[PDB]
From Swiss-Prot, chain A:
Single GO BP term: adenine transport
GO function terms (MF aspect): adenine nucleotide transmembrane transporter activity; guanine nucleotide transmembrane transporter activity; purine nucleobase transmembrane transporter activity
Family indicated by similarity: Belongs to the nucleobase:cation symporter-2 (NCS2) (TC 2.A.40) family. Azg-like subfamily.
UniProt protein name: Adenine/guanine permease AZG2
Curated annotation (Swiss-Prot), chain B:
Family stated for the protein in its record: Belongs to the nucleobase:cation symporter-2 (NCS2) (TC 2.A.40) family. Azg-like subfamily.
A single BP term in Gene Ontology: guanine transport
GO molecular function: adenine nucleotide transmembrane transporter activity; guanine nucleotide transmembrane transporter activity; purine nucleobase transmembrane transporter activity
Topology versus the membrane: Multi-pass membrane protein
Name of the gene this protein is made from: AZG2
Protein name (record): Adenine/guanine permease AZG2
PANTHER family tied to this protein: ADENINE_GUANINE PERMEASE AZG2, XANTHINE/URACIL PERMEASE C887.17-RELATED
Pfam families: Xan_ur_permease
Amino acid sequence: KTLCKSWSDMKKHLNDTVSKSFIGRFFKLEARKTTFTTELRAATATFLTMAYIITVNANILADSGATCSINDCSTVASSSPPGPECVLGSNPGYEQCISRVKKDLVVATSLSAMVGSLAMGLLANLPFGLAPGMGANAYIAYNVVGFRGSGSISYHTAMAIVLLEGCAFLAVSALGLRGKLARLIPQTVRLACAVGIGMFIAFVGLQMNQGIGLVGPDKSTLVTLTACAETDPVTGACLGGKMKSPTFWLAVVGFLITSFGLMKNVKGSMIYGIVFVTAISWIRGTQVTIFPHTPLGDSNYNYFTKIVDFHKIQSTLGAISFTEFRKSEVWVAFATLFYVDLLGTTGVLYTMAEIGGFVEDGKFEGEYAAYLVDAGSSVVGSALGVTTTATFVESSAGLKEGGKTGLTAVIVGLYFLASMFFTPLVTNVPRWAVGPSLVMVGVMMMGVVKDIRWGETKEAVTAFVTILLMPLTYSIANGIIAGIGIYLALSMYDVVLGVAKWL
Amino acid sequence: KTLCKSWSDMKKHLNDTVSKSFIGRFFKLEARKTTFTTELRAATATFLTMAYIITVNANILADSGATCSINDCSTVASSSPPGPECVLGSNPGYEQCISRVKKDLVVATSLSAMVGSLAMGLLANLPFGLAPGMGANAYIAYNVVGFRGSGSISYHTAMAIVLLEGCAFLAVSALGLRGKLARLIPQTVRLACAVGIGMFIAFVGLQMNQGIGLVGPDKSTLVTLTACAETDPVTGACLGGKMKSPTFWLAVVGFLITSFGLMKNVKGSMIYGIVFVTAISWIRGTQVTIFPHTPLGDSNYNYFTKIVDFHKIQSTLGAISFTEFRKSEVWVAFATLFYVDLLGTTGVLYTMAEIGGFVEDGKFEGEYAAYLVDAGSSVVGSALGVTTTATFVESSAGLKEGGKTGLTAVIVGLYFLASMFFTPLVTNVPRWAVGPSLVMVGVMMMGVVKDIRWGETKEAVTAFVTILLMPLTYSIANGIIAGIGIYLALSMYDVVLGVAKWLN
């Protein structure tokens, strides 16, 4: 009976003195009952969920070869490209440009979502967590630019397309047809959109590329477990060992730790799994370290010794040129992504309003201006260096413990600013460390399943195929498109009968 | 015009004649308030529901190279054909094996189903038929024996596993310690295993070799949408041009008709999604036919001319050799295939009991006989050439029509008897027709997912990992092992300390 009531004294004086203020009447912490003491609960735990983009976005875009083309890769003994534009990693110039673009893209992704959430939360008291999503990295790099420049489209022009993409969605946001179309998408497809997100995100954290490294290529089955020790430095082809690697059996323990932490309702355990892996991977001398004795890894400690740095942006702000646009091979991709981005990112934003009970008559408060920030932050992000903001479907974590009113996004943006200053502590995380967070998000997104009306068949066939295709095709567009196409065909007779009585 | 009243005139006296005879006393027609007129509807409705797996079985178990090996290929300009050349296709003598094997397992499946279902009819008084159950076929095909000699062990020990599984499954119910061992698993793991199996059996129906051919390989990512018309002339690979495959659209149309026929509650409808595509891909002239102008086409075309034929089994007899049991990777497959069989029959039989009025305060009339005969069906259909047997969920179609006697199953078996007389008409089913029927199984088996307590976080992780890992590893044994290894660790560190404290 010593620290019980003593610690409770400041709780009562804090939430009461902050409610009866000008901020308390701007953000309306008097109606729609939710308190400051609960909004911290709703937003802090939200922040650690979205920690993987500080790494996986830069990891994705660095493989595409953002900058340092042949002029910088080939600088030692060969003027000609060492294959398709310096594919091999044992090339000087490359080894430090990759480290530079990782820093630059980490800065870019920490600075984009700062204003992505702050602006949207300061306009319509909306508690969500907009940030540059995974719906565009799997395409813009791999299909347009390819694996380290293995494509006919340059990266500078790719940023021009992604820039003009947001400008075009700025017009439709000002027209409001995007919102009126959000009530036209079928209920079942909209519900199945969220489960596919969790399944696809869970799948992307299991490869050697940016995950733990379970799956691997196979000659006849295309998929097999190849978490071996003796691995191909370039691909996932095993040289032998068959699941005797420590990279697995050091992220397994972190996954167990975070699962055990969420069992007993610990406040924040998502970062405990990250820390328990990063701390051991930071020790020099072991076989699971991120610091080999190679000069590529040696230069890391020469910078890792610095713990705090501001690191003003050097060589990714801009890189926009209307040079390759004169031909037709650029507008085909532009149109391919054009009527796909809205069809793959409008459903998720509208879904979160129904989960939080925002809609009262099929329309939630501040609907028209909600899409303005989504359409605008993509413009500033594209020129800065990141792809479009896809309005992450992740604030469901924040909606589960009293996140209803605004100012939730601005305080998450405050943490996003905080993560920037510790730039040596984000770019130095292993790619086998952030892996469990993805499958954690995926299992977290299993709660929407027990809401779909599975009793009927017309509402059950579309959902299964939509769930199946997106992870099994490694594409987000192919799921919603297939769900729409399957649902439309089954309702053909009803539409025909409805238009028959139109006569 | 007196036939309208004559309908009832005979519909009554055929009921008295069967009921007043010793046949009515054999099946107890007077008891349970059942007649003979309802038997035709109770049998045909169930037959049309299970009619789908009479050809999917053949197309699934026919891609294993069950009976011939590298020895009996054709001859080429070299001395002898090497290993990895015959098994990849594009050879006369290996395609002759595949034709003579597809012509044989169709008869084998029907013959095994006769023994599975007639015994139900004559020893259990429980109206549901049994054919080699769908769900255990894919495991044996694509994790045990592999695709055309893939994996590490062959077909001979694949059939040998079934004998030893049956010898033990008979002696887990003979002493009655079956349900005493079934509760070793928590409820979540089996619920996740069913949906994961439904997921895996659907993912296999979307590839180039087996399904339509949607997905494909990639150098950077693992899977991507190919749907290419000009495939690789020898292997399965894309060349150029996507989403314009003439074979792809026909399967989509067939799936659409199947899903449409499910609506309005048509009793047997998914066979329409097979016959409609087969009829289109039976006539020649176009490029989506199964009868090309290649010598394989003419040899196969002078087999569709005859409609009926008594195709005898001559190659796929019992090939039981225990020469490979002295190593490890066969016991894991035996254990997994024993495991998935326990939760299937037990989890379905009670669900069938609570419909129709058979259910009582536990241990209803058809308790003992059914488990023993179902276990014996696996060992009696083992040496024939097919996998284990399981009760079908879609058997409720005849049950929901008042079927309550054992005369239903024996009549159901008689319809399967006529299937082997129609052997040459069903071997010619294309490998782009099974696709929609293979995908459809997942929709039917995933409807139970709304039972896991997703609110609790301790079991949601295990259910999700079990769901995820099986289709993304191309195996069934891997996911259940991973789920057990995760579920065990979340409890022992918290329960062992309490048990030790209570013990001290």
